[PDB]
Design a protein around this ligand. Structure first.
Ligand SMILES: Nc1ncnc2c1ncn2[C@@H]1O[C@H](COP(=O)(O)OP(=O)(O)O)[C@@H](O)[C@H]1O
Ligand SMILES: Nc1ncnc2c1ncn2[C@@H]1O[C@H](COP(=O)(O)OP(=O)(O)O)[C@@H](O)[C@H]1O
Ligand SMILES: [Ca+2]
Ligand SMILES: [Ca+2]
Ligand SMILES: [Mg+2]
Ligand SMILES: [Mg+2]
Lengths: 160, 57, 371, 126, 74, 57, 371
């Protein structure tokens, strides 16, 4: 996952150009010009193995997560690193619990808007208020200003 | 839509529970009011009787 | 530090820190092991659900109260209940808090001694004190005299007190209480077709009794009215549908209090054991006891009992005395409120049974000066 | 906007949180050293004959027994707390498990293996 | 029973933890060495107690978190 | 599912309205009960004084 | 290593490695010896075609299922089916893989003991475990309560479960299933002129039943409509031409499930044995069972059954309870998906019947603690 991007980080999007050339070797002549990886994977399968389109559906759905219907090259990278994962789940969940304890300095068991706001301020991340509310609702799933350990894990699920 | 339906159901259940509790409370307090009113009427009658007794004695 | 005012009771354990108005955690005192086999693996099934958790899974449990009539019959279960009360409902370790248990009058000594031994050895409290359940109910009323009828769920006892001097020869303890009324209601419901047998369905019958039953002002007139009209039949929805209609079972269940011959008990009702308890007192404090009759305990919450009891006592008592029945709206928690008041007093702060005293005299210290 | 950029931002947040945790651990170990220096009475071992040394060793052994009793009690409390933590963690897991079991399918062959098989050795990244 | 049996077991364990101190056969230098050993043992006990206190605070925090999660479940 | 969700939410709204009305009733009856308790206390004091005067006479 | 989640079933053998979404190989469980003489020499004609191979040469075979109603009636054929499943459809030797068979409730003991003896002696597996076919279907739904109606092809059984505690006294096993519906359809097709007799043509009637039949929401209205209009007559092409037209046989074949009097069975339909199974449960878990009724098994795939069953139960049940019928789209493989989930659990990893345990106690080990 991360090793692919790390070994290609010093390079530009030409990795996707090479992937496009490889697809042209197999599925040259795309019509939509949009996100389409099911067809190329199916053509790869058609070389004699057992037909299975569920893997293709999973790969073609791993790209779109924002819900806007658009699939970026960064979304392609996310799909590539999520179909094969080695150091996922934020490494160790015990360290995640330690970080959540750092978040809950009041030790009340509920992260409020104050805790998340101060933690993001310490990070200093420049994210718009829309993304602020998105992250809040991802954490505060029931949307009542309180975030427990389970909500913290869900908010940081697949986050490392 | 299924998740939305579940949320609606739980909200309705909570509201009905609170309604039942309020009904019980109102019943109890109204019974108390009725009993106290009967006692007050009897007390007025007793007070008049006591004043009559004071006069005659 | 603050004191823990626990109150074991029999049917509802009421606990909370000293100095408040209401108990912090009130939950039934039942411990129910599962009875079926269980096929799902890894479901995290425990071996005993205690307290209010076993009132939600009662469909597959066999609930059994650890306190029968005031006395404690199953010490392991009672220890489990206490452990739950301390650690999960209050979340305060007992190593740093005095405790004030409550005990019915005329109970076996061994029960009290075992209670203090448990509190000092297992939970390891700093100091504990055991108080009679009626003196506290007299504290809560803000009086200092009066004869208190504390009709709990396990046992009904009637302790007269004057000017702070309890009269030990006039305590009349009767073992009819809420549990026997539940059993009698469950037994007379069978006259319409509804059969409740399982120990879980006893809870449903208890709910019926709480929500529907009331004490009749005059028994024969109500029996005649319910047998002609149908203005009394109130319906109730079981936990699964199939509504039921209670007719003259409504006022026949709590009538057992005033006629214990219904459940075969010989003794006289709660209307006549109070008068007998008064008449055993001296001739010069009977007027004050007549005027300050106090009701407490859960079972005295039936709608219309404070009038029936007054009518009965006025019938028994001499015509000149004034009969007044104190029935505060906070009847159920009266004992615990009184316990909080007593634990909050400065004069009482040196009556606790300190641990070093127990180490020197053993569990039999409770019968000694530190009562 | 970008999912990879969001993952990068989350990684940076993780880095900041880890740095704060490391700072907390350094503070904890420094406080541990300071409190250990404060509580442990220093050893005044100059100009002392045999008898006072015997008395000091005996009193130190008694104090060692006392502090050992206190530490053992705290260890028992910590063991009880961690047992309760494990019990309640399993309780929450049961209340938040069931469908949480891993629904994973091996029909999805790893794309790295597929690329290696269909391209020999000219697919080295995957 | 068991509770008083637990107390007796605890006190016996503590007595075993009390090491047999015998210095009636050692020179004052050896006495100072043994005193240093006792002080290092007390230092280790203090460090262990402090670590137990920190982990107990952590456990209290986790217990509070678990209570909050249970409240979420209700 | 959508139709069921809509009906459930409407039920919840109705229950909330009922709960508000019950709250109003409870507060009103509570105030009335307090007033009558004070009235009964005055009755008690009057009776005490009348009894004392009767004894003296 | 990985576990083999086999599922014998009766009609379709479903198998695959633990931890996937769908069984790897699904094929009918039929073993058919040739019946004619055979004149070509050296054609390589075998003596018994099993599995999906005998559904292509069925024109000259006599197919015979080795499992009649859950129970196994012909052990040699069942051994042949298992051998085929292990070696040719999965190609994994059983010497290196645990197995998890499935068995209907209330089956004869000897069947289960012989199954474990075969698995341990002939195939020589490391460890095997037998599980009830309904608990798995409850696993797959991700629930932990609910009453599951697993209407397979051999036998329909209805196991209620609450909070992971199965209720052994409320299992209602009924022997009407897909095979009897196939026979009844083959028997009512004769009313139009189409006669299917050969054991090979039973497969054709099964295909007709799968592709055309549906469950009517209201039976009498459909019978009246099909007798006046002709909007229901759907045609179907036999394996040789000569299309046939099915009229009101479409919804009369699967109606046998709700009225087993059609095939002469006395018992009540699957709509009333579920209600009876619920009513045998305790009074406090009936609401949860009402709300979490689960369907599984192949035969519950008829278009329109999840509405007919809900209407029937709502008619029977009290009006207040909510009746909900869970009908996942992956109904057919629900038992096997649940089996995969159960075999993939870490908590379950020590429940297998290890071979040394079998060597010490014999085949009767299965009835013991390792259930
Ligand atoms: N509102 C009520 N109406 C009628 N009976 C009640 C009511 N509340 C409680 N009870 C009865 O009183 C019992 C509880 O009594 P309680 O005072 O808790 O006993 P204890 O003295 O052991 O605490 C219950 O078992 C119930 O039968
Ligand atoms: N799509 C369908 N529509 C109607 N009936 C079906 C369908 N699929 C299978 N069946 C019936 O279900 C049976 C298969 O049931 P299955 O669940 O495989 O039984 P088992 O429990 O033995 O695996 C077949 O014999 C067929 O009669
Ligand atoms: Ca997008
Ligand atoms: Ca929240
Ligand atoms: Mg009481
Ligand atoms: Mg099946």
């Amino acid at each position: 996952d991360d090793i692919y991007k790390a070994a290609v980080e010093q390079l530009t999007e030409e990795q996707k150009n090479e992937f496009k050339a490889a697809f042209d070797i197999f599925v040259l002549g795309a019509e939509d010009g949009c996100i389409s990886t099911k067809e190329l994977g199916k053509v790869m399968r058609m070389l004699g193995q057992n037909p299975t389109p569920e893997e293709l559906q999973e790969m073609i759905d791993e790209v779109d997560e924002d819900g806007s219907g658009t699939v970026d090259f960064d979304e392609f990278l996310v799909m590539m690193v999520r179909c094969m994962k080695d150091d996922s789940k934020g490494k160790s969940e015990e360290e995640l619990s330690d970080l959540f304890r750092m978040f809950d300095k009041n030790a009340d068991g509920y992260i409020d808007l104050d805790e998340l706001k101060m933690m993001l301020q310490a990070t200093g991340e420049t994210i718009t208020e829309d993304d602020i509310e998105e992250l809040m609702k991802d954490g505060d799933k029931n949307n009542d200003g309180r975030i427990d350990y389970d909500e913290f894990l869900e908010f940081m699920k697949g986050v490392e | 839509i299924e998740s939305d339906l579940e949320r609606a159901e739980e909200r309705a259940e909570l509201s009905e529970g609170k309604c039942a509790e309020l009904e019980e409370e109102l019943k109890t307090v109204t019974n108390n009011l009725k009993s106290l009113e009967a006692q007050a009427e009897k007390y007025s009658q007793k007070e008049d009787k006591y004043e009559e007794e004071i006069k005659v004695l | 530090t603050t004191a823990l005012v626990c109150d074991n009771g029999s049917g509802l354990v009421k606990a909370g820190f000293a100095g408040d108005d209401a108990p912090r955690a009130v939950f039934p005192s039942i411990v129910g092991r599962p009875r079926h086999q269980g096929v799902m693996v890894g479901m995290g099934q425990k071996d005993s659900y205690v307290g209010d958790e076993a009132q939600s899974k009662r469909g597959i449990l066999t609930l059994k109260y650890p306190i029968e009539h005031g006395i404690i019959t199953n010490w392991d279960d009672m220890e489990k209940i206490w452990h739950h009360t301390f650690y999960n409902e209050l979340r305060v370790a007992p190593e740093e808090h005095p405790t004030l248990l409550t005990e019915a009058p005329l109970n076996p000594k061994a029960n009290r001694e075992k209670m203090t031994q448990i509190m000092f050895e297992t939970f390891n409290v700093p100091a504990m004190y055991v108080a009679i359940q009626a003196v506290l109910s007299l504290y809560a009323s803000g009086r200092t005299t009066g004869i208190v009828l504390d009709s709990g769920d396990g046992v009904t006892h009637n302790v007269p007190i004057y000017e702070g001097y309890a009269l030990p020869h006039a305590i009349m303890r009767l073992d009819l209480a809420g549990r026997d009324l539940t059993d009698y209601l469950m037994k007379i419901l069978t006259e319409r077709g509804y059969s409740f047998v399982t120990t879980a369905e006893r809870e449903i019958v208890r709910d019926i009794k709480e929500k529907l039953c009331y004490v009749a002002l005059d028994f024969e007139n109500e029996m005649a009215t319910a047998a002609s009209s149908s203005s009394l039949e109130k319906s109730y929805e079981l936990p699964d549908g199939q509504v039921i209609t209670i007719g003259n079972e409504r006022f026949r269940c709590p009538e057992t209090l005033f006629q214990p011959s219904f459940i075969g008990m010989e003794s006289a009702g709660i209307h006549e054991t109070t008068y007998n308890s008064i008449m055993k007192c001296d001739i010069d404090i009977r007027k004050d006891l007549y005027a300050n009759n106090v009701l407490s305990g859960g079972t005295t919450m039936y709608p219309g009992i404070a009038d029936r009891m007054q009518k009965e006592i006025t019938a028994l008592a001499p015509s000149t005395m004034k009969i007044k029945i104190i029935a505060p709206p906070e009847r159920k928690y009266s004992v615990w409120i009184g316990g909080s008041i007593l634990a909050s007093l400065s004069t009482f702060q040196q009556m606790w049974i300190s641990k070093q005293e127990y180490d020197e005299a053993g569990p039999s210290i409770v019968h000694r000066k530190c009562f | 906007i970008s999912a990879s950029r969001k993952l990068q931002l989350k990684t940076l947040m993780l880095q900041i949180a880890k740095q704060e945790m490391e700072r907390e651990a350094e503070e904890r170990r420094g406080e541990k050293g300071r409190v250990l220096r404060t509580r442990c009475q220093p050893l005044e071992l100059d100009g002392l004959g045999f008898e006072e040394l015997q008395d000091l060793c005996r009193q130190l052994h008694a104090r060692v027994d006392k502090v050992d009793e206190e530490r053992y009690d705290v260890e028992a409390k910590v063991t009880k707390n961690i047992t309760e933590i494990a019990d309640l963690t399993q309780k929450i897991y049961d209340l938040r498990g069931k469908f949480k079991r891993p629904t994973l399918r091996r029909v999805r062959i790893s794309a790295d293996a597929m690329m290696q098989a269909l391209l020999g050795t000219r697919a080295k990244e995957s | 029973g068991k509770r008083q049996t637990e107390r007796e077991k605890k006190k016996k364990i503590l007595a075993e933890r009390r090491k047999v101190l015998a210095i009636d056969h050692l020179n004052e230098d050896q006495l100072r060495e043994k005193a240093k050993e006792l002080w290092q043992s007390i230092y280790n006990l203090e460090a262990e107690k402090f670590d137990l206190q920190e982990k107990f605070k952590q456990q209290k925090y986790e217990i509070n978190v678990l209570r909050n999660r249970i409240n979420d479940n209700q």
